[PDB]
């Protein structure tokens, strides 16, 4: 009952901050752009420093005209609404939020380690204790996000950020959605799609547990379990239900992946009667102290290079381009809701 009431109290903070969302609470002159952390068609992510507080934050700017053009406002609606209503040690904290002419802004806590993708690719493959450390944080995050009826729908190393102490900070909530029944929106990444999403059928929260099985596989092997020359061959492999494990996979890891990467929805872990405890009690997490992970008392097996503050040594410099501002408010009526 000690954990059953904690999540019940977390659902109260959620629904409270959910029905009446936050409002604009800063000006763009408070933060100067130091360097570009990321970019895309919808917008960009810059490293900005608080001129009134002397600290760094992560400012994600989104071009308002482009968001209307790419048919993504609802995804910006839900992402902004979910990121202010949730609170978890492994989720990113939306420090500030303020709309402006031609742009929308989201000031998040600056994660100094970058994506897990770069570290995994650089290192090659994580060890099972190293991967078990990262998998546990995802399990406790999926357990808390599922209690709030939320589905993440885009789990991949490109959207997992390693903070300063070696822990995981989840960022991209573009396809996040609060839903109690089922959904039918085809979204994600081909290598990480569950077989039901591929067969154009209705899917539920169990697709987040298929992604966990793919994610653990990629961390422990260095490559995803379903890859091919053409995306159609990837969709064929996923629905086929055949997974080949590397030589160095422990028998316990092979068992957990066979339960997670289960094409049969009625036998997949996390979607059974016992719920999330199917995975936390597995013999692979038999060295994991879950409460110590949540309290963040477990020593990290890997620490990102953080010799000094403001160092983007773990990110890519890209090209530095300023933000185009207008005198005419490009804010559509929907952007009032943000």
């Amino acid at each position: 009952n000690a954990v059953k009431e904690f999540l019940a109290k977390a659902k109260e903070d959620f629904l409270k901050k959910w029905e009446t969302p936050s409002q604009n609470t800063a000006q763009l002159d408070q933060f100067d752009r130091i360097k570009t952390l990321g970019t895309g068609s919808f917008g960009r992510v810059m490293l900005v420093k608080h001129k009134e507080s002397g600290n760094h934050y992560a400012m994600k700017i989104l071009d308002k005209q482009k968001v209307v053009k790419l048919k993504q406002i609802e995804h910006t609606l839900n992402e902004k609404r979910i990121l202010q209503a949730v609170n978890f040690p492994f989720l990113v904290k939306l420090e500030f939020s303020f709309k402006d002419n031609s742009n929308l802004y989201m000031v998040m806590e600056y994660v100094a380690g970058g994506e897990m993708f770069s570290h995994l690719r650089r290192i090659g493959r994580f060890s099972e204790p190293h991967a078990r450390f990262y998998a546990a944080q995802i399990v406790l995050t999926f357990e808390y996000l599922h209690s709030l009826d939320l589905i993440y729908r885009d789990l991949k190393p490109e959207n997992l950020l390693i903070d300063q102490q070696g822990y995981i900070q989840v960022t991209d909530f573009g396809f996040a959605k609060r839903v109690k029944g089922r959904t039918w929106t085809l979204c994600g990444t081909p290598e990480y799609l569950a077989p039901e999403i591929i067969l154009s059928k209705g899917y539920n929260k169990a697709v987040d547990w298929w992604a966990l099985g793919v994610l653990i596989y990629e961390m422990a092997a260095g490559y995803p379990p379903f890859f091919a020359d053409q995306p159609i061959q990837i969709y064929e492999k996923i629905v086929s239900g055949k997974v080949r494990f590397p030589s160095h996979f422990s028998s316990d890891l092979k068992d957990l992946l066979r339960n997670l990467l289960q094409v049969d929805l009625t036998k997949r872990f996390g979607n059974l009667k016992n719920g999330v405890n199917d995975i936390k009690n597995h013999k692979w997490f038999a060295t994991t102290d879950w409460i110590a992970i949540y309290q963040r008392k477990v020593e990290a097996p890997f620490i990102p290079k953080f010799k000094g503050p403001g160092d983007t040594s773990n990110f890519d410099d890209y090209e530095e381009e300023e933000i185009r501002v207008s005198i005419n408010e490009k804010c559509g009526k929907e952007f009032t809701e943000f």
Partner: peptide, 17 residues
């Protein structure tokens, strides 16, 4: 567990239609 190709190991991009 096949012959690894560099294109599959690059940064994957999300999608929705």
């Amino acid at each position: 567990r096949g012959f690894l190709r560099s294109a599959s190991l690059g940064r994957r991009a999300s999608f929705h239609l």
